[PDB]
Structure formats: C-alpha cells, structure tokens
C-alpha cells in the first residue's frame, strides 16, 4: 500500500509542529501573530497582507517590513538550528 501512513512521518510531523510552535513563541507577540496569519499556521487559512494590516491597524508596507524583519530573525542560526535539522 504505497499511500499509507508511514508511522514515522506522522510522529515527525507532530514534533515539527511542536518545535515550530516553540520557536514562534520565543518572539514578540505582534511579529508572531503576523507570521502565523501570513503563513496560515492558525487554522490552515492563509491571510492576505491587507487583511493582516486591517486586523492589526497598520499599513501594508509596515506589515511587510515587520514580516521581512521577522523572517530574518527566524533565519538567524541562533533560532534556526533546531529547525535546520528537520528539513
């Protein structure tokens, strides 16, 4: 059955979600909410840039600048090693 649950990818996916929740929780609240709403980690629905800007009360260029800075912060190795081994 070449399309079954491989029983180690499921537990690896659960540990990946746990580690991603940890690394996202070690940030600022506004940046973490922006990243979650941008990549759809809340409820599986990705949100638009103007939608995040509307619900957080700032402009879209401010939102995308905060997103770029937060993506740099996550790309930094100090936060990035424990997720670098997963991929």
């Amino acid at each position: 059955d070449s399309e079954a649950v491989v029983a180690v990818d499921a537990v690896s996916f659960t540990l990946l979600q746990d580690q991603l929740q940890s690394v996202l929780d070690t940030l600022s609240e506004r940046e973490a909410g922006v990243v979650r709403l941008r990549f759809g980690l809340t409820d599986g629905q990705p949100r638009t840039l103007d939608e995040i800007g509307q619900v957080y009360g700032v402009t879209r260029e401010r939102i995308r600048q905060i997103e770029s800075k937060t993506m740099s912060k996550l790309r930094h190795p100090s936060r990035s090693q424990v997720l670098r081994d997963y991929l």
């Binding site: 770029s68 740099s72 790309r75 930094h76 100090s78 936060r79 090693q81």
Partner: protein, 76 residues
C-alpha cells in the same frame, strides 16, 4: 557534535538584535572564536540580510556598517 561550541546559539537569541550600539558589541565580538565565520559571512552577504549580527559583523538593510550610529546628535 560541534553545536554547543558554536557561538551563535550558545545563549539567548534575542541579544543579537538589541537596538543599542553598546549592547550588541559583545555579540559581534563573541563570534571572534566562531569556527564558521567564512561561510556565515558569505551567506549573509549574498542573501542580503537586513538585520542584526552576522558573521561577527553588523548589518544595515544591504551592507556592512562599522559601528551602529547612536541615537542623538552625532559628534562634530
């Protein structure tokens, strides 16, 4: 492996983006003993990182500044 010897992720990661010129100075010089300064600095220069300490050097949005300019009137 050599992970606890790696000076990037030894301590708190929020230090390396502190917005004071004197706070990040020990963060920049703490990568003096880093074993992977060449590849880290090379990746940081090629992918144009806009923030924080990278390869034992600070970064603006595109390039390398020597020391970050403090808040206030600069010295004549």
């Amino acid at each position: 492996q050599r992970l606890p010897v790696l000076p990037c992720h030894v301590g708190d990661p929020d230090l390396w983006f502190a917005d004071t010129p004197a706070g990040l100075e020990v963060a920049k010089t703490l990568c003096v003993s880093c074993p992977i300064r060449r590849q880290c600095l090379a990746a940081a220069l090629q992918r144009a990182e806009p923030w924080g300490v990278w390869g034992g050097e600070i970064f603006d949005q595109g390039s390398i500044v020597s020391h970050k300019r403090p808040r206030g009137r600069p010295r004549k």
